[PDB]
Amino acid sequence: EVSREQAFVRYLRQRSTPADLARMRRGLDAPGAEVVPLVEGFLGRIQDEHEDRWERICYYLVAGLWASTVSSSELEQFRKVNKGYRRTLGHAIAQLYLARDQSKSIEQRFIALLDADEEQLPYRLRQMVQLIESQDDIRIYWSELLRDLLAWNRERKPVQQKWARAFYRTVAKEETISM
């Protein structure tokens, strides 16, 4: 059923107050450093012995980005193999890429994103989400985003692999949808 990242996002949707969102937003430059009881509560109900500074950064970052959203797709998320890829940020980014005439600068910004280390990531992701949110119609699956960020430092780099494949798979798909 409901994975922990799903549960997390549901909880933010159901329980956040406007004050929480203000804090979540404010913490964007140093996620975790701006404490939000709501989030702390959720992390304090699992973490145990994973002083995982990463986890805390990822949760808080997703909170902040989510708390910043403007997408029409989030207005829907209040009512409600291939599925794998569409649900990843790679797919969202490709959609943005195609919306802007297959713009090489998005592709580059995207490659740069896949190169990020832990320190670079919160910043580059924040810029990309921002770009994505400029297009009205593109959904970002937050729970998948969080799961993916959590696994960023895995060894043969599966998330980054996964994203890349989603991106080029979507682009290719469009070159077929057109005839």
CB of 84 to Hg ion, least distance (A): 15
Binding mask 129-148 for Hg ion (x = CB under 5 A): ------------xxx-----
CA trace torsion 80, 160, 163, 171 (10° rounding): 160
Identify which range of 60-68, 79-87, 92-100, 157-165 contacts Hg ion by CB under 5 A: 60-68
Residue 16 within binding range of Hg ion, rule CB under 5 A: no
Contact (CB, 8 A) for 102 and 34? no
Q: Residue 13 or residue 104: which is nearer to Hg ion going by CB?
A: 13
Contact (CB, 8 A) for 38 and 15? yes
Residue 149 within binding range of Hg ion, rule CB under 5 A: yes
Identify which range of 37-45, 54-62, 129-137, 167-175 contacts Hg ion by CB under 5 A: 54-62
Residue with the shortest CB distance to Hg ion: 58
Binding residue for Hg ion, selected from 21, 24, 58, 65, defined by CB under 5 A: 58
Query: What is the C-alpha to C-alpha distance for residues 57 and 35, in angstroms, rounded to an integer?
Result: 11
| Helix H or strand E encompassing 123 | helix 121-134
Q: Residue 20 or residue 100: which is nearer to Hg ion going by CB?
A: 20
Contact (CB, 8 A) for 148 and 89? yes
Query: What is the C-alpha to C-alpha distance for residues 115 and 123, in angstroms, rounded to an integer?
Result: 12
Residue 66 within binding range of Hg ion, rule CB under 5 A: no
Task: Report which of 146, 143, 140 is spatially closest to residue 166, judged by C-alpha positions.
Answer: 140
- The contact set with Hg ion (CB under 5 A) reads 57-58, 61, 141-143, 149
